[PDB]
């Protein structure tokens, strides 16, 4: 009661030595304690950071999983926990986080709530220091996730941070499955020792290259790799928001055929027979199988294939089976692969490599004096890619468009609107492909797009600029690309513009019909999923569901999902044609016309295909219906012209100025969404596009 | 055929109530409202219990043997009978023991429910042991007659009441700096509460301090004033104020640290336009 | 709080306001990026409070 | 000697209303003073800079 | 905003006037008052004077 400065006075010193002692005992207190306090407060500030440690006793029992990120953000974390913990098999696992930076302010609370407090452990520390790999118990983890930082100023240096971190965790914990997410495809062979590698540029560009053939493919592969129960938007009043939110719960699952209740009875029968009758009876879509002899996975091996007791079956179903109650173009491989590990693919090739002068559009060469797509006179509709710097990633946009199984006459002239002149390394790669051109420009100015041929272009893929990814604010990354696209949505209403967004939260700005108030309704659909904690809160956005917007934050889930499903990366990279195992099918598309309207139900469509061409339909891309006396009248007419007339008068005048014919210039009241594996009783309305997995032509 | 998804997990009895107790966000706060209001209820019945008794008429174990007790300063010995024996009631026994059993079964159900890691984490946590020491003696008292009127520190439930309250405000609001100074007020309330009740009960042997006199004394002690008109005269109460002081310098600076970590955040993000104002202003 | 976050448009009661004034920042290093901050802020306040008169001050024509 | 947390004890409240008053006076002090202190320390940092002024009376003579 | 953008000629609705200027010379000095200037204009050219740009000798 004396050193607490209370001093009741019931017990007091009465004699002068004790009185001196309490005086001298007080005085030493104010001279010995503040010194201890000073070093403590000098360490009070250090306690804020470097917080956390995973006890060695916990590692022997808790069965944790480490996640070595360079900078953890709220969006990246909640896309992982909502996915890592969406499987019942992973409810026991602890998530350790090795982030060299301190916890973000908004990451504090989401790790403080009782749900994510007994599961998630945060340890500030780099994976490149073995002193911090002992805290996380890397030698005891069941999986290690290294994720590259997308929003850094250097993209080839944020990739070397990952190669060394994959190297540091490999020699410290040699017996630990490694999971790497690499940014660029040239650095993909240095992390080849890892069990599961997902490359952003190789996978993203190959899906933006499939939206041109099979619309909303980047959306089909997005809802497949996002683990959800399948109950999003069931309370919605709209009919499509009920069914589309249900069929979007379909995932790719695997099972041995003999242990499967779905496919047990079709042993010894044709694969197309088992695939159809499984969908007819139970509603599951059997896309492909892997034999026991080989480790290769084949998508739709074909009708000639016969089931066996040892084969593994890959199907699409709402949940896992165990959780169920009941001139001539020569065909050859491209000679110059821009990077090591580039997948060799049978492609359409020109007989002679085109000279670099023949690829350029705006300025002609000695061979051809044409200067624009009008002069070339392409038979098919163009494909314009408004990328910034042509590189190894963009080369993956051309291979799926030029692959051999695509019809030769249906080839679409690819035109690249590169901000910077392509290097001679990139031109050597694409000089072999047919009808692949480039021209300097940008999506902002109107003359460049008119010279490109945007009048008669089916698609304008606006690839994200690598310069803007490092933007500080979230909206600042896509503030220019959203507005530039919004200018072309008004000028060219019939055009199909596919946009890559740096941040998925910027989808609200994309469509933006001013009079329509449906954007408010789309947020109410998201609030109930926000409280329910669903992966696809963005699922019901109009641009996303139609396949017009794709951020690479949608495919980060492909890596975490690969922990429980080791085949997901191979299945995804097989659908996009990124890797080509011999005997494996390819993702195709068919348009249901009025001549096919007698096939009322989706099930009857399955029956027709599985008996004639053995093509297995994955899903449906469904579209809905959601002199002062003379110029005195020139003043009155030019003042009352509508904005649609003013914009139409702008493009036509420019075409007159650049020299293109004014004719041919002469609007989207349409709703689209992706039904993945709909029940066989669903109707087949007109203008339906059905995804297919056609068998390998060379089977 | 007809197939219903995810029946493997939800059909199980354990996993169904796992969602009810932990997984479901809306149900969690409803469950915590039950526990926090219950913990306030048992603390209030404690304050009632000490209120209506007058130990001047006799203190005993239970039933017949009750005799008046006196204290003198010259004898340096402590009569330990009033420290343990108190003629709490028949009905306050009943309502409180219902709370005691309910809390025990609820928490032991949570113990098994959230068990994943060799049940080392659950037992060690201070929240678990605090509930054991103030409910387990109160569960075994059902068996014997002479142990019905036995003192149990049930005032300590205010700490778990505060723990329930902060687990509440972590997720929902029913500002940010206000969300912490509110908790700082609570721990000051709990710290005073145990000091008032502890001194009152420990002073049943001597000084026969009333509940209000102990409260005044407990306030002039935690404010470091210490007039000295009311002081502990017997060594258990002297120990209590010593141990009550020591916990104060180890529980309060931790609350202060997070408060000052939120003192800096109160400078920015200031202001909000109340929904009631928007309808009229 | 930013007008681009609907969590901060609820505090200001944008659905109840009698007018919304977005003013571009004149003294920023980028003048075509301080204008896109205003186009998106005019878009964000328009889909959150569709029945609210909007007042925009844009920098470039 | 009460608001300085000294509390000698020679003069003390002996009756419960006065005992309540010193208790409620200690409580209001702990809730009204830190708010004044917070704005003062927010102005303690501003006192380091912008220091000094030349008095108008000095200018007439100095 | 429409009135301002009409004075500067930024938008031109048909039938709307434009902001002009006139210099009062010594030949117009017999029009002593601004009101008498209003009378002359509103009876000959129907031009409505807004204000005066007055110059002094400071
Ligand atoms: K003191
Ligand atoms: K004192
Ligand atoms: K004192
Ligand atoms: K003091
Ligand atoms: Na899904
Ligand atoms: Zn040439």
Angstrom distances, CA of residue E22 to CA of E33, E41, E57: 15, 11, 20
Cα four-point dihedral sign A499, A503, A508, A514:
negative
Tokens of D50: 């912008």
Q: Do D7 and A5 touch (CB under 8 A)?
A: no
Cβ-based neighbours of A582, under 8 Å, separated by 6 or more: A696, A698
Resolution of this structure in Å? 3.2
The Cα B217–Cα B222 span in angstroms is: 9
Expressed in angstroms and rounded, the spacing between residue B256 Cα and the centre of ligand 4 is: 16
**Stated length of chain A:** 699
Kindly list the residues from chain C whose CB atom is less than 8 angstroms away from the CB atom of residue A509. Answer: 40, 43-44
- What is residue A436's three-state secondary structure? strand
Q: For an interface test with B, give the residue of A7, A10, A263 to mutate (most B CBs within 10 A).
A: A10
A234/B contact by beta carbon, under 8 A: no
Cα distance between residue B225 and residue B33, in whole Å: 37
Tell me the three state secondary structure of residue A39: helix
With beta carbons less than 8 A apart as the criterion, state whether A396 and A461 touch.
no
B233 Cβ contact list (under 8 Å, min separation 6): A10, B73, B206, B207
Which residues, at least 6 apart from B217, have a Cβ–Cβ distance to it below 8 Å? B199, B209, B230, B231
| The pair of three-digit structure tokens given for residue C43, joined into one six-digit string | 């878009």
Residue A96 three-state SS: strand
Tally C-beta pairs within 8 A across B and D.
39
For chain B, give the secondary structure using H, E and C.
CCCCECHHHHCCHHHHHHHHHHHCHHHHHHHHHHHHHHHHHHHHHHHHHHHCCCHHHCEECCCCCEECCCCCCCCCCCCCHHHHECCCCCHHHHHHHHHHHHHHHHHHHHHHHCCCCCCCHHHHCHHHHHHHHHHHHHHHCCCCCCCCCECCCHHHHHHHHHHHHHHHHCCCCCCCCHHHHHHHHHHHHHHHHHHHHHHHHHCCCCCCCCHHHHHHHHHHHHCCCCCCCCCCCCHHHHHHHHHHHHHHHHHHHHHHHHHHHHHCCCCCCCCCCCHHHHCCC
Mutate to test the interface with A, among C3, C36, C59 (most CBs of A within 10 A): C36
- A182 by DSSP, 3-state: which? strand
For B150, the token pair is 């036995």
- Interface residue A264 vs chain B (CB under 8 A): no
- Strand A616-624 with A671-676, pairing: antiparallel
How far apart are the C-alpha atoms of A622 and A601, rounded to whole Å?
14
* Short-list A248, A142, A92, CA closest to A563: A142
Ligand nearest to the CA of A368: 6
Q: Which of A509, A520, A523 sits opposite C40 (nearest CB)?
A: A509
How far apart are the CA of B11 and the nearest CA of chain D, in angstroms? 54
Cβ distance D9 to B229 less than 8 Å, yes or no, reads yes
Residue of B227, B263, B268 to mutate, testing the D interface (most D Cβ within 10 Å of its Cβ): B227
Q: Give phi and psi for A624, each to the nearest 5.
A: -120, -175
Question: Exposed (0-12), middle (13-18) or buried (19+): which is A664, by Cβ within 10 Å?
Answer: exposed
Q: Is residue A85 helix, strand or coil?
A: coil
C-alpha span between A305 and A271 (Å, rounded): 6
Judge whether A570 and A343 are in contact, CB under 8 Å. no
Residue B82, exposed/middle/buried by CB under 10 A (0-12, 13-18, 19+)? Answer: buried
In terms of Cα–Cα distance, which of A417, A375, A450 is closest to A650?
A: A450
Q: Is A9 on the interface with D (CB under 8 A)?
A: yes
CA distance readout (Å), B117 to A60, A187, A311, B97, C3:
9, 39, 37, 31, 46
* Chain B residues touching chain C at CB-CB below 8 Å: 269, 271-273, 275, 277-279
DSSP secondary structure of A605-632: HHHHHHHHT--EEEEEEEEE---TTTHH
- Please write down the HEC assignment for all residues of A494-562: CCEEEECCCCHHHHHHCCCCCCCCHHHHHHHHHHHHHHHCCCCCCCCCHHHHCCCECCHHHCCHHHHHH
Q: What angle, 0 to 180 degrees and rounded to 10, lies between the N-to-C axes of helices A479-491 and A643-658?
A: 90
Q: Which run of H or of E encompasses E54?
A: none
Rg (C-alpha) for chain E, rounded Å, is: 14
Rounded CA-CA distance A641/A627 in Å is 22
Q: Among A570, A610, A573, which residue's Cα sits nearest to residue A692? A: A610
Report the 10 Å Cβ neighbour count for A459: 22
- A358 labeled part of a ligand binding site: yes
**Bridge-based pairing state of the strands A671-676 and A251-256:** unpaired
Please tell me the number of the ligand nearest to residue A6's CA: 3
Alpha carbon separation from A186 to A183, A342, A395, A552, B274 (Å, rounded) = 9, 8, 12, 18, 55
Candidates A479, A514, A519; nearest CB to C33: A479
How far apart CA B224 and CA B209 sit, in angstroms, is: 20
Please give the Cα distance from A76 to A504 (Å, whole number): 11
Could you tell me which residues are beta bridge partners of residue B223? none
- Give the pairing type, strands A95-99 and A120-124: parallel
Closest C-alpha among B278, A478, B266, B275 to residue C4 = A478
DSSP category for residue A276: H
Residue with tokens 């590259």: A148
Between CA E58 and CA E56 the distance in angstroms is 6
The tokens for A19 are: 């009185």
Flag if D9 and B216 touch (Cβ within 8 Å).
no
By Cβ distance, the residue of A1, A114, A318 closest to B167 is A114
CA distances to A246, A287, A553, B236 from A678, in Å = 9, 14, 26, 75
| Residue (of B10, B28, B48, B4) closest to B169 by Cα position | B28
Residues of D in contact with A7 (CB under 8 A): 7
Q: Does A515 touch chain C (CB under 8 A)?
A: no
Strand-pairing partners, residue A120, are A95
Closest-CA distance, A421 to chain C, in angstroms, reads: 24
Distance CA B117, CA A52 (A): 18
On chain D, the residues whose CB falls within 8 A of the CB of A9 are 8-9
Which H or E element spans position A233?
none
Mark yes or no for CB contact C13/B272 under 8 Å. Answer: no
Q: How far is C16 from chain A (nearest CA, A)?
A: 15
- Residue A365, annotated ligand binder? yes
Q: Is A79 helix (H, G, I), strand (E, B) or coil?
A: helix
First CA to last CA distance, chain E: 36
* Torsion sign over Cα A315, A317, A319, A321: negative
Tell me if chain E has a CB within 8 Å of the CB of A636.
yes
Cβ within 8 Å of residue B207, ≥6 positions away: B71, B232, B233, B234
Residue A5 CA to ligand 1 center (angstroms) comes to 4
- What's the CA-to-centroid distance between A258 and ligand 5, angstroms? 26
Q: Contact, E11 vs E5, CB < 8 A?
A: yes
C-alpha B197 to ligand 3 mean position (Å): 22
- Across the strands, what pairs with A134? none
Contact at CB, C11 and B279, closer than 8 angstroms:
no
From chain B, pick out residues whose CB is under 8 angstroms from the CB of A115. Answer: 22-23, 25
- Answer whether A touches E (≥3 Cβ pairs < 8 Å): yes
Q: Cα(D41)–Cα(D45) distance, rounded to whole angstroms?
A: 6
Task: Of A470, A560, A502, give the one whose Cα is nearest residue A79.
Answer: A560
Please name the residue that has the structure tokens 């975490």.
A560
The tokens for A434 are 């047919």
DSSP E52: -
Q: Which residues of chain B make contact with A62, given a CB cutoff of 8 A?
A: 116-117
Tokens of A214: 């099979």
The residues in D 36-55 lying below 8 A from B, measured between CB atoms, are: 38, 42
Helix, strand or coil, per DSSP, at residue A470: helix
Method: cryo-EM
CB atoms near residue A356 (< 10 Å): 15
User: Alpha-carbon distance A272 to A614, whole Å?
Assistant: 6
For residues A91 and A473, give the distance between their C-alpha atoms in angstroms, rounded to a whole number.
35
Rounded to whole angstroms, how far apart are CA atoms B167 and B184? 14
Please say whether the beta carbons of A322 and A399 come within 8 A.
Answer: no
Cα A219 to Cα A546: distance, rounded to the nearest angstrom: 8
- Does the annotation list A368 as a binding residue? yes
Q: Please check whether residue A203 is in contact with residue A452, taking contact to mean a CB–CB distance below 8 angstroms.
A: no
User: What torsion, rounded to 10 degrees, do the Cα atoms B170, B171, B177, B178 define?
Assistant: -100
Q: Which chains touch D (3 or more CB pairs under 8 A)?
A: A, B
């Amino acid at each position: 009661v004396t050193f607490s400065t209370v001093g009741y006075g019931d017990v007091t010193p009465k004699i002068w030595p004790s009185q001196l002692l309490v005086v001298i005992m007080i005085c030493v207190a104010l001279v010995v304690l503040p010194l201890q306090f000073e070093e403590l407060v000098y360490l009070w500030m250090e306690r804020q950071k470097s917080g956390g440690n995973y006890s060695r006793h916990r590692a022997q029992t808790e069965k944790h999983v480490v996640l070595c990120v360079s900078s953890l953000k709220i969006d990246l974390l909640m896309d992982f926990l909502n996915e890592f913990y969406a499987h019942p098999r992973l409810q026991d696992y602890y998530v350790v986080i090795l982030c060299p930076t301190e916890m973000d302010v908004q990451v504090r609370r989401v790790l403080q709530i009782p749900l994510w407090s007994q599961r998630v452990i945060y340890l500030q520390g780099s994976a490149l220091k073995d002193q911090d790999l002992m805290r996380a118990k890397m030698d005891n983890g069941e999986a290690c996730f290294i994720l590259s930082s997308r929003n850094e100023v250097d993209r080839t240096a944020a990739d070397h941070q990952t190669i060394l971190r994959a190297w540091a965790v490999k020699d410290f914990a040699p017996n630990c499955p490694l999971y790497v997410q690499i940014l660029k495809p040239e650095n993909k062979f240095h992390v080849k020792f890892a069990d599961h590698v997902v490359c952003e540029e190789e996978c993203k560009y190959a899906m933006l290259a499939l939206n041109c053939i099979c619309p909303a493919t980047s959306t089909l592969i997005t809802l497949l790799v996002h683990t959800s129960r399948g109950q999003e938007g069931q309370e919605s009043p709209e009919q499509w928001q009920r069914m589309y939110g249900r069929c979007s719960g379909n995932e790719v699952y695997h099972i041995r055929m003999g242990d499967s209740k779905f496919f047990r009875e079709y042993e010894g029968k044709s694969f197309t027979y088992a695939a159809f009758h499984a969908h007819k009876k139970y509603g599951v879509c059997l896309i492909g199988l892997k034999r026991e002899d080989n480790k290769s996975i084949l998508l739709n091996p074909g009708p000639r294939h016969i089931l066996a007791a040892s084969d593994t079956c890959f199907y699409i179903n709402i949940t896992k089976e165990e959780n169920s109650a009941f001139v001539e173009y020569v065909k050859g491989y491209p000679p110059n692969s821009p990077y090591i590990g580039s997948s060799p693919t049978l492609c359409h090739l020109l007989p002679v490599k085109a000279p670099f002068c023949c690829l350029r559009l705006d300025k002609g060469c000695k061979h051809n004096s044409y200067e624009d797509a009008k002069a070339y006179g392409f038979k098919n509709k163009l494909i314009i890619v408004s990328a910034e710097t042509a590189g190894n990633g963009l080369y993956n946009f051309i291979v799926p468009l030029r692959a051999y199984y695509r019809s030769r006459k249906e080839l679409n002239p690819i035109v690249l609107l590169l901000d910077n002149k392509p290097d001679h390394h990139f031109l050597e790669a694409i000089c072999c492909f047919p009808m692949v051109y480039y021209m300097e420009g940008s999506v902002d100015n109107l003359d460049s797009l008119l010279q490109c041929g945007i009048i008669y272009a089916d698609n304008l893929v606006v690839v994200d600029k690598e310069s803007t990814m490092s933007a500080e604010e979230d909206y600042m990354a896509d503030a220019k690309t959203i507005v530039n696209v919004q200018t072309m949505f008004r000028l060219f209403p019939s055009l199909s513009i596919t946009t890559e967004l740096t941040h998925p939260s910027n989808m609200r700005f994309m469509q933006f019909r001013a009079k329509d108030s449906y954007s408010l309704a789309l947020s109410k659909l998201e609030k109930r999923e926000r409280e329910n904690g669903s992966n696809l809160a963005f699922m019901f956005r109009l641009p996303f569901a139609a396949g017009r917007v794709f951020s690479i934050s949608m495919l980060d889930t492909l890596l975490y999902q690969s922990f429980v499903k080791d085949y997901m990366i191979t299945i995804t990279r097989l659908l996009l044609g990124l890797d080509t195992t011999p005997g494996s099918g390819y993702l195709c598309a068919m348009k249901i016309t009025e001549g096919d309207l007698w096939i009322r139900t989706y099930g009857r469509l399955f029956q027709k295909l599985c008996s004639s061409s053995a093509e297995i339909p994955i899903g449906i891309y469904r579209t809905e219906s959601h002199a002062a006396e003379w110029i005195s009248q020139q003043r009155l007419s030019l003042y009352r012209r509508s904005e649609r007339q003013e914009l139409s008068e702008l493009v036509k005048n420019r075409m007159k100025h650049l020299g293109l014919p004014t004719t041919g210039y002469d609007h989207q009241n349409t709703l689209s969404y992706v039904l993945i594996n709909p029940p066989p009783d669903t109707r087949l309305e007109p203008s339906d596009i059905v995804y297919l997995i056609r068998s390998d032509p060379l089977a | 055929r007809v197939q219903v998804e995810f029946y493997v997990n939800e059909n199980t009895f354990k996993e169904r109530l796992k969602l009810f107790f932990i997984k479901n966000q809306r149900s969690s706060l409803r469950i915590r409202l039950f526990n926090f209001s219950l913990k306030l209820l048992t603390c209030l019945l404690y304050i009632v219990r000490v209120l209506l008794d007058d130990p001047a008429l006799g203190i005993g174990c239970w039933g017949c043997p009750k005799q008046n007790y006196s204290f003198n300063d010259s004898s340096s010995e402590i009569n330990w009978a009033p420290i343990l024996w108190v003629e709490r009631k028949m009905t306050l026994w009943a309502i409180q023991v219902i709370v005691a059993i309910i809390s025990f079964l609820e928490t032991m159900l949570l113990i098994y429910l959230s068990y994943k890691g060799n049940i080392w984490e659950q037992i060690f946590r201070v929240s678990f042991v605090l509930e054991m020491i103030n409910t387990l003696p109160f569960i075994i008292t059902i068996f014997w007659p002479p142990l019905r009127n036995l003192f149990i520190p049930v005032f300590l439930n205010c700490w778990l009441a505060k723990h329930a309250l902060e687990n509440m405000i972590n997720d929902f609001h029913r500002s940010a700096m206000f969300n912490q100074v509110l908790i700082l007020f609570c721990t000051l309330l709990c710290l005073v509460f145990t000091g008032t009740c502890g001194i009152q009960h420990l002073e049943r042997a001597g000084e026969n301090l009333s509940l209000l006199t102990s409260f005044y004394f407990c306030i002039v002690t935690f404010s470091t004033v210490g007039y000295g008109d009311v002081t502990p005269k017997i060594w258990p109460s002297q120990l209590l104020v010593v141990i009550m002081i020591c916990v104060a310098l180890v529980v309060l600076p931790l609350q202060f640290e997070e408060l000052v970590y939120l003192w800096m955040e109160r400078q920015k993000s200031g202001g909000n336009y109340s929904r009631h104002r928007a309808q009229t202003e």
